[PDB]
């Protein structure tokens, strides 16, 4: 996901990375928006389904 | 400098737009905050989000508004909170040209700097003879020894002349020496029934005339007086007369509450309570200014810095309302209840 | 909820932009109306046009603003016109997060909700002793039996204390019990010439002193009295003395007409006549509210709902002006003869 | 026509955004001034640049604002400057539909034209009995021959009735004939200690009653009186009684300073000095109008053209502030030394 949110075949958008090197820290979007949400917590399930 | 103040106001008013989480913003707003927050976080190193949701994200933003609000008014509050620390770099952000400002904000600042750097005639608030030490009973005969005409104050906007039968004389001196009027609007009446030195009722006969700078004026009509001309009162009547001259209102170059559009409400807004966290924050900020920290200044300020501050704080107050921030403040012990008219009353020292 | 009202406002304000038939609109408007109108007709099924030209198209748009206005307020007008019917669904349209609102309207509501939710200090409009049943003649002696010092009212904002030679005492209790002041601003003077119990003129010798909470105060100067401190008057003079104390103005928490910027101007705009159609409309609308249907409120309101309603109606009034809508209304019989001050006068009951 | 005015206003406020050289503009503005200027330089052949830097470029822009300001107000100042030639074709530019106007500008003009065309109830600034020729001593007994009850004025907002033991009678006629009131708010009190025809102190006993239209009213309470109902006073007491009735405030359809939001603050901004160049320019402009050229109108204007003019000038004033224009004016000689409250005082004739 990360690798590909980051693959821009069109004009690039503002990617404001996070302090952690962990994938999905950035906030791509002209309105920001965390990609940290689509991380992967098993106790929450914050990224994938339900 | 003015450009800086407008940007700060623009940003604050923009942060107020965030009433909900998923609401669609005006393309204009996103474009602005997108640049503002991007550059602020660069020189401050804080984490402000365009779409705050948590609380820390909400505080972070409010803190930013505070940092800017202060940088613009040129204030340094110092250590007033364990959570907050003022960054002086905030002024550098408000000067970055690439950060636009609204037409509304520009026209708002131009108005403050405008009237604040010059003077103008305005209806003064209180009575003319307000700063007087002595006052006489209204409608009572009083003739100063050796005079045929004796003008004397009897109210905050009232004077009464006591004329003898066939007496005449100038009165303009009782007014002069006070304030610095440009025009004093008058309206004289005949005291048809007054008390004598002893107590008996005495009538004033029709015929008593008053003339300004020469020309004779009617009774009960407003009279534009320049304060310099000859205010002459005559009494061709064969009895004792008494007339009252009223200063309905007067104009002077002293700044009033109408120097800036609805400045009154803007002030009231800042001086309002909201909650303890606000009360203290607003107070602590005013301790750096010439303005009374928790009670409306009896006298409307007149300097750029004063008014500018009131507006930035009035707006920051609104930003407070919408963001609902929660943080500690030195010396402030917040009562977590619903808040009543009583609790607010007590908060004002 | 506030967002809702803000949207409704934004729309009406946007509708007022329609002055002519072929003029181009501000980018901002064509973005708002385009969405709004579509979403409105989507749940209303009415024929609202972006550029109304006929009259039926104009009436339709006005009915729209009306619906949004009423909805944003929470008003169910009931059967008031045969040509107009209120669609409760308009609320759902205003709740649509997709319809944007202006920054101006955002802050506008934020202010109302902000202040209307809390209290604050403000200059009261009327005299301190306005609600008094008994008043005494100004400048006349009066000593209540067995007392050496006698304080008494003499006007809406005036009291006078009768002191005997060498007498002293507290006066504060004549002020307390009335209202709930936070700070009373005083300015005392000497009644140099007053009437005695019989009618003879008397003089107040210089030397009388008025002290607040202990510290001595000058005459003719404004004084910040907390209302609780001891108001002590002393007469070391060997004669009868009378001094008047004036309540120039006082501050309390009760809301005033300055709680919100130019609230008055709006209220006027709402209570204004225009024509019989508007008159009856505005009236019938307020019948559902706590506000007086055709004569300004004696006392300024204090609840969000009321304030809001007024702002909304005021805006809807401007919309009325620009759209020039013509339609029926129960109990309203229009007189086409060029409308004059006389005709308008009659309409107000 | 209103469209022409709103456009002019928009352009001025748009120019007011230019506080610096490099600053980025709100894309909204760039659209407005891009069009406006293109069509201006086309119909006037002047060289106005969107991004002024020199001074002549700044002046040129101001002259444009002035040209529009005048064209919009319908004014022809004539030859008032050797540098400025008012090109009348500006109206043609302000009529170009391709030129957009702000939502704010629309709602602004809609308000002016709105209330200016109709009437409405206002609080009225001065006292009820302000235009009276005669006045009596407050608290002094007076009984017109053959009567048992005598109403008599004693102040700008005060009257007092002298009742004999067991007397009764109507009082309303003392109020009638004056102005055109819709609702007069009263509040009567009992003059507990008054002066007799001779001077001795008399007491007013508890039992006196004041009834409006038949219903008995309490003392010290505000009363809504239409001005037509019977204001009947009764004295069932076996002594002479004197009561004071106060007109706290009344309402009439006469335009006040609250017709348009913060009208006062706008007025002040226009009557301000800034510098001689401004002063004279403003004066010369008002010489074409029915408005006083350098002193606040005693009575608030009431026609579209007036109010409209004021606003256009108020804005033109801020436009002045931001642009910093420097030009010659017939009959005006600039004094470059720093400008003080004194220098300004002198300029006002």
Swiss-Prot record, chain A:
Coiled-coil regions listed: none
Intracellular or extracellular location(s): Virion
Annotated TM spans: none
Family the UniProt entry places it in: Belongs to the orbivirus VP3 family.
Function: The VP3 protein is one of the five proteins (with VP1, VP4, VP6 and VP7) which form the inner capsid of the virus.
Name of this chain's protein: Core protein VP3
Species this chain originates from: Bluetongue virus 1 (isolate South Africa)
Protein encoded by which gene: Segment-3
Whole-protein residues included: 402 to 451 of 901
From Swiss-Prot, chains B, C, D:
Pfam families on file: Orbi_VP7
Keywords noted in UniProt: Capsid protein, Glycoprotein, Outer capsid protein, Virion
Name this protein carries in UniProt: Core protein VP7
Keyword Cytoplasm carried by entry: no
Any one Gene Ontology molecular-function term assigned to this protein's record: host cell surface receptor binding
GO BP: fusion of virus membrane with host plasma membrane
Cited InterPro entries: Capsid_hemagglutn (IPR008980), Orbi_VP7_capsid (IPR001803), Orbi_VP7_capsid_C (IPR023178), Orbi_VP7_capsid_N (IPR023176), Virus_capsid_a-hlx_vir (IPR008935)
SUPFAM superfamilies found in the cross-reference section: A virus capsid protein alpha-helical domain, Viral protein domain
Organism for this UniProt entry: Bluetongue virus 1 (isolate South Africa)
Cellular component GO terms held in the UniProt record: viral envelope; viral outer capsid
Subcellular location: Virion
Main subcellular location of this protein, as a coarse class: virion
Cited Gene3D superfamilies: 2.60.120.170, Bluetongue Virus 10, subunit 1, domain 1 (1.10.250.10), Bluetongue Virus 10, subunit 1, domain 3 (1.10.170.10)
Transmembrane segments: none
Role played: The VP7 protein is one of the five proteins (with VP1, VP3, VP4, and VP6) which form the inner capsid of the virus.
Record family assignment: Belongs to the orbivirus VP7 family.
Keyword ATP-binding: no
Quaternary organization: Homotrimer that assemble in a complex of 260 capsomers on an inner scaffold composed of VP3.
Disulfide links within the chain: none
Glycosylation sites: 287
